[PDB]
Structure formats: C-alpha cells, structure tokens
Scaffold this active site. Structure first.
Site, PDB file in Angstrom:
ATOM      1  N   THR C   1      -8.695  32.710  32.820  1.00  0.00           N
ATOM      2  CA  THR C   1      -8.952  31.241  32.823  1.00  0.00           C
ATOM      3  C   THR C   1      -9.156  30.703  31.403  1.00  0.00           C
ATOM      4  O   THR C   1      -9.648  31.401  30.511  1.00  0.00           O
ATOM      5  CB  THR C   1     -10.195  30.906  33.691  1.00  0.00           C
ATOM      6  OG1 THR C   1      -9.851  31.002  35.070  1.00  0.00           O
ATOM      7  CG2 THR C   1     -10.730  29.509  33.418  1.00  0.00           C
ATOM      8  N   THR C   2      -8.752  29.460  31.206  1.00  0.00           N
ATOM      9  CA  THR C   2      -9.057  28.722  29.990  1.00  0.00           C
ATOM     10  C   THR C   2      -9.510  27.304  30.348  1.00  0.00           C
ATOM     11  O   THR C   2      -8.762  26.548  30.978  1.00  0.00           O
ATOM     12  CB  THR C   2      -7.819  28.602  29.068  1.00  0.00           C
ATOM     13  OG1 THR C   2      -7.267  29.891  28.849  1.00  0.00           O
ATOM     14  CG2 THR C   2      -8.193  27.977  27.747  1.00  0.00           C
TER      15      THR C   2
END
Lengths: 203, 203, 203, 203, 203, 203, 203, 203, 203, 203
Positions: C1-2
């Site tokens: 995830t970012t």
C-alpha cells in the site's frame, strides 16, 4: 517470477517475465530469466538469483563441452538428467531454484527440475510464484494441435494473467521459439509488444 | 548507507554518502564507499564494512592482474560475473554486502550484485538502507537523455533525499563520473558543495 | 500500500492507490483506502484491512455523533487524539494499522498515527510499504508554496513512483482535496487520468 | 531520542530534539518531546511514542485536577511519586518509556523515572538513545554555579553532540526554562538558532 | 573499558584506563590496554582480553619482522589493512575485540578496526563501553588546532568523564604521545596525576 | 548495590551506598537506599528500584497506621512477618527485591527478606551485588562486643571494600544508628567523611 | 573453591582450600588445588577438575623441559604468556578453568589467567566461588609492607572467611611461600593449624 | 476448495466444487460449499468446515430476522459489513475461513471477506486452494459484457481448471445464478453436466 | 503416490499411478514411478522424486554391470540387499524414499525397502500415501491362487480405490507383468483402459 | 480404532471394533464404540475415550429430552447440527474425537463430525486409525443396491481388513442395523461370528 515452457508438434515455446524483487521491493524491472544453453536448448530460471545464474553458466559450459566432445548436441533428457544429478548431489546445501529445460532433439521436450533434483517431463510446465495463474490459463486454453503463432499468443496470455495477480511477477514478456528449422530464436520486442496490442492487454 | 549508479549515453555516474554506524551510534562521518577498481571501473559498497573492504582490495588486485595479463581491461560484465561466482561460492558463509559495479567498455554499464552472487544489469541502481528514497527520486526525475551535468545533479538530489530520511545515511556526498574520454574522475569537494548550494539543499 | 497526505497554505491533499494483496497474490486491484470521515476530514488506511475498515466505520460514527452533540466539527487534532487513545488502549491486542488523518479546522493539518497510538503532526506524511519511495519524491519536490494544482500533481508523481517499485502498491490513484471553500472533494477519475497523461506516466 | 534536564540555583532547564524514527527510517523530523504539565512543571518523553503521549495527557489532567482540588501545585516529588506508582502498577504490561520530570516548588528538581516506576532525583539527568553522549558533555562541562544563560548553552551543546553521534536523534533543539519568577517558558526558535550560531554548530 | 585516539597536526595522542571486570566484579584495577607496537605506532585494545592480548603479540612480532625485512616501518594504513585481513579471515570465529591503531608515517593517523575486520580512518576515535561518553566530550571540545598539551588534557577529560559514568571503566589514565621527533613516548604517572589535579578531577 | 545491617548489644547500624546503574551505565551517583520506616525501624533496599520504592512507601504507611491504632510500634519481627506475607502473596509476579529490616523493640534485630517472602533473622546481614565482599569483611572483623563507634567504622570498611570490587556499587556511604535512647539517627555526611579519612580510604 | 595469591617485597604467598563438590554433594574434602610447577613457581587451580589437572601436568612438563633447554627458569610472565596462548588457542572448546600463577624471577609476581587466555598481573588475586569473600578481606587488610608471617596470617583469614560463606569451599587451608632464599616451600599442617588457633578460627 | 463469484449486468453467478479433505485424505466427495442465505443472496465457504458451517447458520438466521424486522432484504454491502464486524471482533480467536457473499439489491454485488474481517467488493473473486487457477482463467476470459449463459460456462471452466491442478479441489461443480427476476436459482445437475460435455471436459 | 507389487505362482505384477504434487499443487499428471531395472526385475518409487530418480539410475547401472560380470542376473533378494546396504549407509542423510523391488529368479519375489535400509519380503506390498487404501482392497480380495489376468484386475482396482481417496494419487494406472516366459512386459495403455471399462471405474 | 457407517435404500448399518490402546499397549480388548442414542439413531466414537464417552452420555440425555418435549425424534441432520455447534463452541479446548451419527427419519442418513464441529453427510463414512483400509474395501465393493445382508457382510469385511493392518484396531466386530420397521437392532455375537466363518476370515 513466472516462467512457462510448452511443446507443440515440432516446436518448443518458452517464456518468462523479468521482475526481480527483494521482498515487496522491486529492485530490477528487466532481469533475464530465459537463456539459450545449446543450439536447440533453452532454460528458464526461478528462485534464488545467484544459484540460478551460476547454474546457467555451468550448463552453457557443460553443454558446449559435450557438443565438441561428442559432435552431437546433448539430448534434452540428458540435460535434465545432468541437472538432476547435480542438484541432488547437493540436496542438503541446495541450489534454491526451479528450472525449466526445453528443446528439440529427435522430438520436442520440456522438463521441470526442482531443488532436490527431481526432474519430470511434461507437455507443458510453469515455474515461479506466478505459475498457478499460468496453469489456469493453460488448462483452459492449451491445445496440442496449436500452431507456433497460437502458442506464442497463449504464453503471452498466461504470463499476462500471472503479472496481473502475482506482485512478484512483472516487466516485459520474453519469448523464445525452438525449432529444428531455425534453432533457438528469441522473438524480438517489437513483435511481442505487437501481439500484446493485438490480443488487447497491458505491462 | 546510500549508494547509487546511473548510466547516460556515454557516461556512468556513481555516488555515495560516507556515514558509518554501529546501530544508532554514528562512529564515523567520513568513511569511503566509492572506489576506483580499474581504469574505467568503479565500485560502491554497502553492508558489513569488513567484508566490503576485503572485496574492494580483491577486485583491485584481480583486475590489475587481468589487465596486465590480457592487455585489455576486464569487460564490466566480466567484473560482475567474477563477483557473482566469488560471492555465490561462499553463499552459506557469505560476504554480507550489496555491490554496485559501474564502468565503460564498448558501452556504459551498471550492475548490482547481492550477497548470494545474484547480478543484474540495469540503467540505474541503488543500494543500502537509503536506497528506497533514491529509487523514488530516480523514478520521478531520471531521463536517459540527461547530460552528465544533469546526472551529477540528479544523484546529489537522490542522495540528499536519502540522507534526510535514513538515519543510517549521512556525511559528504561523494561523486565519480566515468567516461571513455577522461576515465574515472572523482569530482572534487568544492564542486559538489557548489552544486548542493545551487540546488538549494543541506549536510 | 501507498498513502500520502500533504498540507498547503489553505488545503490538504490526500491520495492512495488501491491494490489489495495476500502476500504476492494480487486479490483486488480496486480496494478503497481513502475515506471522508467528516465535513472537512479525511482518513487513509494501511495495514490489516479488517482492522482498518472497522476503524473507518468507528470514526465516521464517532465524528458524526460529536458534530451533532457539539454543533461544531471535531478539531483535526482532536480526531488524532481520539485515535491515539483508542489504539493505545488496546496496544497488546492492537489494530495492526497505520492511519493518516487530514483536514481543515482553523488551519490545515495532517497527522500520522501508528498501531500503538503514537500520533505526530507533520507538513506531509506517507504510509504503507510504498511510503519510502513517496518520501523520496516529496523530499526532492515538495514546496510549502505549492498551489493546489501543483500539489495534486506532486502526489500523483509520488504514488506513481511508489507503484513502480513496490509490488504491494498498484491500481488507480485516488485523490481528495480538502478546503474550507469546497470541503472534502474527491477528484474524479477523468481528471486524475488526464494529469497522469499530461505528466507522462503509467498504471 | 535525546532529552536532558538540569538544575541550577533557582531554575530548571529541560531540552529535547524532535526526531521520530521507525528503525532507521526517519518518519518525522519535528515530533514533540517536551511538554508543560503544570505551572512550574515540565516533562520529557523517550521510548514508545504511544505510551509516552498517553502519559503526557494523563499527567496534564491529573495535575490540573490536583491543583484545583488543593489550590496549590503538586510538589515535583509528588508528581514523580505518582508516576512511580502508575508505572509500577503495570510493570508486567508496562508503559515502555523513560520520563524526565522537572520543576520548581520550594526548590528546583529533576527526577528520572523508568518503565518499572523507579524514580531517582538528581542535579541533572538525560534519557534516550543519545543520552550517553549528553552525559559526556555534562560530566565535563556542567557547573552548579552556572547562570541560566550558561545552562541553556550547555544543553544546546549536549544535544548537538548527541545529534552528531546518535542517528536516532535529530531535528530542532527544543528548550524550556522554569523559574519561580516567569514560570515555564519555552524558548522561541529564533533564540535557540541564534545561540547555535553564536556557539558555532549545525542541524 | 574506555580507549581514545586523537590526531593533531604532527602528533597522535592515545589513552586508555585500566579496569578489568568479569561482569560487575572488578578483578583488576591496573590492566594494560595501550601498547607500543612499532617505533611510531601504538595500539589500544577493548573487548575480550585473551583475544586482544594475542593480537598485541602478533602485531609486535609481525611489525618487527616487517621492519627488518623492509628497513622501513610499516605504514600505519598498512598495519590497519593487515589487521583488517586477519580479523575478517576469521569473522565466523572472530577475535571479539575493538582495536585502535595510531601512529606517524608521512602524516599522523588513527584507525579504528572492528571484530569483522572493518577498518576506518578518522581524525579521532574511541572504543569500549565508555566510548559514547568520550564522543560527547570530543564533539564539544576537540579542535584540529589544539597543541599536544591541550590534546593530552582533552583525552584526560574525556576518559575521566567516561570513568564517571561507565562502571566498566576505571583506574589510572594512561597516555602516550607519538611524534616524529620523540617517537612513541608514554607519559609518566606523576605528570598525568599532576594534570588531573590542575584540571580539578578524580580516580 | 551494597547494603548492610549489623546488631550490637543495644544498637543497630545500617548502611548503604548510593549508586544506581542501568547495566554498566551509571545513571545516578546519589540514589537513596536506606530509609527510616518507624521510630526505631530502618529498611534498606536492593533490586529493582521501582519495586523497592513502592515497598518503602507501603511500609511507611502501614507502620504509621499500626502505631496509631495500637499506640505501640510494630515489633521488628512483626514488620518482617508482614513483608514476608506481602512478598510471598505475589511470588509468581514478585517484587524483585532484597530487603533488610533493622530496629529496636525489647532488643535489637536485623532481618533479611527475599523476593519470595523468605525472612531470616541474623546478627548481621548484607544485600546486593556487593554483599559477598561485605560478608568477607564482616566474617573477619565483626565482634558482638563492638561499640557503636567501632560498628560504624566496620560498616564503612565493609562498604568501601564492596565499592572497590563491585562496579554496581559506588557513591557516598550512608549510615544510620538506631538506639532506644536516641532513636533512628542518620549520621551526617561530615562525620562519615571524617571517618573515611581517619581509616585511610576513598570514593 | 577458593584460591588466593599475594605478593610482598621479596615473597609470594599462595593458598587454597581443598573441597571438591559435584553440585551440593561434597565428594572429597581433601583435593589438591595448589601445585609447585617450577623451582620458584606455583599454580592454583579452580574450575573443572579434569581440565585443571591436565593443565597442571602440562605446565610441570613444559617448564621442566624449558629449564633444561635454557638453563634458566622460565620467567613468571613467560609462564603466564604460555598459558595465555594455550587457553586462547582453544577458546571455543576451552579449558574451563581459572588459574593463578605466582613466583619469583628478578621480582615477585602473581598472574591471573581465565578460560579464554586473558592474563593480567596484579599485587594480589583470588579465584573460585569463594573469591569475592577473599577480595573483601584483602581490600580491608592487605598491606604491601606486610611481612611474610603477616601475609600467611592474612591469607588464612581470607580463606577462612570464604569457607564460612561459600559452601563450595571447605577443608584444610593449604599454604605455600615462595622466596629466592628458600624457593617454593609448602608450609606444614602443624604450622597452619597452629596459626588458625592463634588467630581464633575454625574448619 | 475452489469457489468463485462473478457479476454481470443484472446477474450474479456463484459456483463451488464439493471436495472435503483431511490433508491428502479425500473423506467426502460431495460436501456443500454454496448456500442461499437470503432471497437474492448467496454465500460460498472455504477454510475450516466447522467455522464455515456455523457462520452459514448465523447468516441465515440473522438475515431472516433482519428481513422480518425491516420488511426489506439486507443490502448485500450490509451483509458484508455484518460479517466484517463479526469476524474482526474475534480476530485473535478467529473463524478460519474465506467467504464470498454475492447478491442483487439495486445492483449486483460480490464481496470477499477474510478471517480478520477484511471485506472488499469486486467484479469477480475466487477463494480456496484452487483460486489462483480460477484467477488465471478469469483474467484471460471474463468479460463484463458476458450473458448469463456465457458466465455459467466461464465458471464451469474456471472450476474445472482448478480441479485439474489442485488436489484439494474436486467433485461435482455446483452453480447458482441470482437475478431480480427469478431470485437465487441453483442450476440442476443435468444442466451443469450437459455443459461440461458441450464444453468438452471431465470430473 | 500409490505403488503396489503382488506375487502369484509364476508371476509378479507391479503397478503405480503417475501424479506428482508439490503439496496440494498437481504439477505433473504423468510422471513415471515404475521402471524396469533388469531382465526380470522391476522397481517402483515413492517419496522425494530426486532421490528416487537417482536410485533408479544407480540400480539400472549396477545391475547391468553385475549381469555382464557374472553372466547371470542378480538374484532379487540380492538387489534388495544391495539397496538395503546403500540406504542404511547414508541413514543420517537419507534417500527419502520407499522402494518396491519385484522380480523372478528361481521364484517370484516382492521386497519393500524403507529409507533406513530396512528390507522385508512379502507376498504383496504397497507404498506411498495411497497405500493404506490398497492394503484394504488386497486384504479383502487377494488370493495366492489368482491368475495373472485376475491379478492385473486386482491391482487396477486397488490403485483406483487409492486414487479416489488420496489426493496425492492420480493419473493413468501403469502396470508391468514379470514372468520367466516373457520377461518384464509393460502392459499397453489400450489394454489397461479396456479393463478399467470392463470393471466399471474412472480417471 | 475402526468405525464405519453405510446407508442402503431403507437401512443404516454401523459397525466398530473394540480395541482400546495406550500407545502400543493393548489395555482393553472389548471396549464399546457403538451406541444407540435414540429410537432410530446410533453413534460411533473414535479418538480420546474420555471425551467420546462424555459426548455419548450428553447425546443420550439431550435426545431423550428432545423427544419428550417434541413428541418426535430429533431429525438425524438435527443431531449432527447439534454436535456441530457443541464441538465448534469449544474448538480451542476441543473434544478430541471423530463421530459418526447414523439413523432413519424420513430417509436413512450417515453424518461424519470432526473435532472442530465440521459435519458432512455421505452415503458412507469411516473413522479412526483403521479408516483408510475400510475406505479401500468400500470403494471397491460398496453398492447402493446392496441388501441389508450384503451390507452387514461388507462392513464385516471392511473392519476385518482394517484389523489386519492397523494395530490400533482389534477385537470382536460389533454391528447395528437401523430400520424404520425394527428400529436400532444390535446384531448378536453368534450371528456376526457365523458370517465371519461363512466369509472365511479371523479375530
């Protein structure tokens, strides 16, 4: 990683993608995982890169030597048997790899060899984290009766699917066709890209 | 640590910072992590200092010897293949390092080698704890079409970013440019500092 | 995830990508990681999906209730303090998450909260596996003096960089701008895609 | 982290730096580690941020309450005794922190409290990963007879040294002076920076 | 243990204390940790006494031999490179030590070597449990422009600080000054004690 | 730590030193380890500081309460029995301490209590890491027929010996004499120092 | 076990007790722990009996051989250096012992050697489980200016103390005096017993 | 196990196979893994049979109750949110399952819920050991524009592929189609078998 | 895997199936597990494929060599004794296999050898994960008086049963009949399939 | 242990053997593993004897109670659902059993329940260590069209086979037939023995 090798009536098609990760960290997008190792022989690598790369070099050396000494190319099953013995000899300090060996002698062949030296022949085979997705595509779509053009399309699809669902797989798809007539030809990038467009796909 | 190597049309730029820590404890602010190892070849080191420093000396020795024996410099890919074999030979008692090898033979090259001997060529690469930050800067800002001056600025930015966010990185930024025309030139400190000012930065 | 949250003079921009993996296996390409939780408040989630999703619902509920009871929105620092207490209360059986909370009260704010309840305010922050790459881009390219349009472009670049190098990140980039004037506006997909083209990028 | 608290004849000087790391990854450069918790009382925090932040809030609440109920400020030794009891009560599921409590009642005081509730008074004390470097500076340079201006300089030096050798420490130095006359005053940033220049230093 | 080595324009000062502990048990108050190993070379030892003492003897032997064979003293960097190779050769069954090597060849030098053979040169360095305290004092008080007398005072202060805060350090401070003019001179005890008084200190 | 308690015909002498360490790190040189807990009762503490300090406070409270309720002081054996019950009640989550309890009721007494509530009376006893060294001195030099002045000298010697050989012990020696005639009197520092000189000793 | 070795102006006194235990079980009350190993050299052993006894025999052999080959006795420091090398050579499969080596060459000497080959010289030393008690007695009572008779009394006292407080020590006290004039003389039992009475003691 | 759920313009298709294994031991060939849980809602189960079967019963009960109390069916997203809360509530003693929930409210929906309560909506999803193979087939062959008949064929193919390559999958393929018009209809066995023949397949 | 070997009056029947799994993942549906290793000798393999395949090759080589050297075939008990010695020689680094060896010398024989070299003769034997199911069928249905045609049918049944209940077993059944009259004859696929139909079965 | 339950058109046959072992030690040859638990219901038990016996008693009680309260027997599927819930309720402190539940309501049924509450219906099922052998016999020999007499013979054979190959199984075979017409009838021993003879078998 995703590698695949299929056989057709007088051909062998081998393909890989090119992603190299250290965990989730994509360090290299264009590593090489498909290699010519003899006139009509190719090898794909999955697993620990160092171990794989050393084995690629050994096989190039050992098969070039064999061919000069014998004046014939090592039978594809002989290549697989050689890897089988080497890997098993060091099973307790293993080469942490999965290998596909494909080629033409009197017939087309694909062999899958594991880190303990277990080698099995099959009409098709896939290796690496993305392989289960490839096996799905191939179960549904592979025909023995396929043409080389149809085969190249099939593997492009299989690897494209694996790229979509295995984060450990990605990068340009890399294809080699092996025939008695032309030998081991690595398809050019223009051509692969072209078929990605014609089939309607991505990366 | 943060090291980086990039390639441009007829050049290779390599840079590092200089911090040496034992855990959180900054023991040395000016260690050396970038070394010339041949006429047109450079190496950056990350990982266990002792293992790295030994390898630097081996490579200097082994390449000097090769050059005298062959009357040509070792191809950059040959240097990477040598390190590949050496590190893999001892994979179960490994050199706990990450190496970048960069140089010019008939073309520019950067290779990244890991502690198991896995070596991959790439248009750019970074190593050490600060490398993910460098990879950020490079993804956003690197062009193949960059000039050497633009490249030098780019690596200074990347390493500056990494210094800001990796406590294991710090100290003076250290840059080498490698061209066929002038060979391995290590930029002087005046000049690097000058560009740190002109780009508007710190440490 | 970012995920990423930045602050500008009278605005907050928050963005995420949408990939959901179980290990290397990309199970969902369009999960949601950015949520409006109050009139001028947004939250991004990283970590264990179940824990995150529960917390999103709690915060929606708890802030709606507060607002009706107080007739004013919860101060952004109050939202962070609430999460701080909740997560710390259960630190030994924790919510395995990283949260960004962003919004406008009398000024813009971004807070980063961890799984033990540690909350720190900052001018910008990023979370998830891809965050180090974002931190690279932001260190190099963020200005306090940026306009909202420049900010939106900056986060698109940062997340694009992270997508390129973190296999745990991918999918459509998802952006919200929060101003006193228009509130929490989620940018439309046409518009984000348009800027991906104008900046010259991919996925 | 580096925090310090010193006593002089009628004053207490407390200082910290502001870096917040997750391992080697510098996530926040300006966290807050020095807090006023009563009219003539300050607290510094080191250790797990969530646990520390919860304790800061409890102490603010508990001392404000005490002061209204008693119409006098809690004695500094009483604050330390309260923390002592709270932390020890939960020793097997501890607040993973090191606390400094400083203030003036009938005299100046600095107390150092650990994660098991051990509290010891001392003429000076430092906490966090950078503390050993501070203890070096203070052993060599601290005088009981120092003026408040000399003390502020001394702590700036101690923390500057710790920042130079502890990668877990960094960011702006943050100083509070506590006197009967003016109470808890947090020095402004202009002023701290000014003395950093006058003493000839960095970050 | 606390050892320190500093460099000045034409001099090297090296000092240690003398305590030998088995855990908290002070078994010897006057062990030796500073040794002359060549005409203009000294070594300090920290870590496992047995390993250190063996290494002192090897270095004496190896440098005496080298000198007779070459008719010049081993360059200080050569001594550090030799130790580097020796210690790294046996990294998996290591000499559990930290070494300082200081001396004069064409210039003054101090090198710090660790148990895996990592060697780094520096303008000053400290080793042992008391080293962080020394690093405090030196960061605050060391100047390149110091005179030999000022240096001797500085190391006495640094070690006195470390003795005050590291229970693993104690005993008489032991100082050697190394110049081209007088060689390795070990300062007498009268003189060290005298300066301890003149600087106003203890043990 | 080193604490000692001795009995003479009509007196009890109790002494400690004041060092507080976190491992080898001397954080505090003047902690308090000897406390008056009733009119003719004293307690010394060794072990985990938090646990000890809580117990000191409990005993002060519980004995003050007892005395008001009963109009007599708790017998010294009763105080030991109370501690015995308290500590044993929580043996599986223990107070990690060693306690000496000394005083006068109808006769002088010294009791030693351990972390599982085992309590044994003795004519003398010592606790802490330095206790074995004290036991040496006492075995050789203690007489039942000693005068209070001789006793005070004996304990100063014992603790001085322990300070010389236990790095976990150090700081000012702290002495209390307990008689029916004058109660619990803590000797002043002038006087202790004075005897350290007269006996010819250090710290 | 308790062994001790002290030095006086022209003498060395060495003593041990004789108890051999397997855990709490006293299997032998009169084992031997003090041995003459050269004309003016003695050795005491503590630790694993097998390892110690082998070493006693090696040292007798190696010093007898040396003496015949050199026509001079091995210097006491040479004996310590030899043990140092032997024990360190096998540090990972060690002789689980503590050794004292005492004797006269041009001066008196006592050396203490540990299981890793660390050897330190000292004016006095003690080894074994009872050594801390001895160190107490010696710190309080040892003078450099003592006469041989005073020394013999001092060691009897020290070992008597240790016997009283270390259950792993017991049995007859065993004493040797080493002078240039009379060599290594083992005091007779009548005489030791006599002084035990004259000093007023037990076992 | 292999389960799959897909969405088309006005329909949801859900299918499973029926094998139940204890390790490699096929104990049941016709277990049930697809259940109607509301008028227009279906659920598939994978993971621990006991946990799954309990959850099937709870959902039947809870949705029947909801429907009577509200007089409308629970929205499909509401069913997923309920499961989300339930499973997350007990995350540390979890239901060891993977659930698919599919149905029609105002639109078609498929949700995938994991053992920690993470729920994500998607246009298609698969669960169980055979799911990667299904994801292959679906990536290659699924269209949004498919008709219900085409969909039914697609899932039959996907599950047939998974049966061929996952030994944990096998038995009769079981299919339900959910439309506003006819509700949850479970296709009959004649019809499924018929299409297996028409598509040319096995088990 | 399932292998079986039975004996009748003048015959040996050996059969296997062909499935190769990596856990639950069916990688190959037609591996080979039955091999002719001499004129009247066959071998089946179960366990680690690499180890088995190596052993097949060794036995082929060793028995071909024996036969040329002796001019008679190795007795079947001799082949088992040879395997027994080989496998036991390496018991602590074993061939992780189960082997059946069957053949005719002066009589029919079947031997079962395990990974530690234990070899036992029996009238019938089965190996692999499916063996317990075979043992069921054989206990109920095997007669010594069976004809070769009845035997072939019996093993087809046994292996079909095992395939139905062991997911580690599957694929084409593979049968060899060994008689003095015709030697080792591998039955053709037409014929095996034919009997599968006649007996009314599947895969 | 070996238990089996099969269904025929209007009947259920259940059988067990009677051996009870503690490891290899046969403590009881005639334990009971088949129980009537309702008018047309039977239960077999395998696994931990204590847990199984408690469950037998609970089910007798709970079904007798249900029948009196409802005036109808609990449906066989209801009995399985009840056990399902009970066993799953305590899955983390489980009843370590395998249960078969067989009976007639409107049709015959056999259910197999595991220790986590997983319950599956099947036309036949077997449990215990000997179950794989039974599954062999049943796969080969079971017909839906069997008569009750044929069924009784089949289960005797299956359990006889299991007894021959599972040392944890043995003793008298114990059979119950359940019909609407005669209810749960346990066959007498004469009769079972008689058929063992007529089929030609043992124990």
């Amino acid at each position: 990683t995703t590698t695949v090798g299929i056989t057709l009536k007088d051909a062998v098609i081998m393909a890989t993608e090119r992603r190299v990760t250290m965990e989730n960290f994509i360090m290299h997008k264009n590593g090489k995982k498909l290699f010519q190792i003899d006139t009509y022989t190719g090898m794909t690598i999955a697993g620990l890169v160092g171990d794989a790369q050393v084995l690629v070099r050994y096989m190039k050396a050992e098969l070039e030597l064999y061919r000069l000494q014998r004046r014939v190319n090592m039978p594809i099953e002989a290549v697989a048997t050689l890897l089988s013995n080497m890997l098993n000899q060091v099973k307790y300090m293993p080469y942490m790899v999965q290998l596909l060996v494909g080629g033409i002698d009197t017939a087309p062949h694909v062999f899958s060899i594991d880190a303990a030296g277990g080698s099995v022949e099959d009409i098709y085979a896939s290796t690496g984290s993305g392989s289960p997705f490839v096996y799905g595509v191939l179960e549904s779509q592979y025909s023995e009766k396929m043409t080389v053009d149809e085969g190249v399309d099939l593997v492009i699809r299989a690897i494209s699917a694996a790229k979509q669902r295995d984060s450990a797989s990605g990068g340009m798809i890399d294809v080699a066709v092996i025939t008695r007539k032309d030998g081991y030809v690595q398809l050019p990038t223009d051509q692969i890209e072209s078929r990605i467009r014609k089939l309607g796909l991505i990366l």
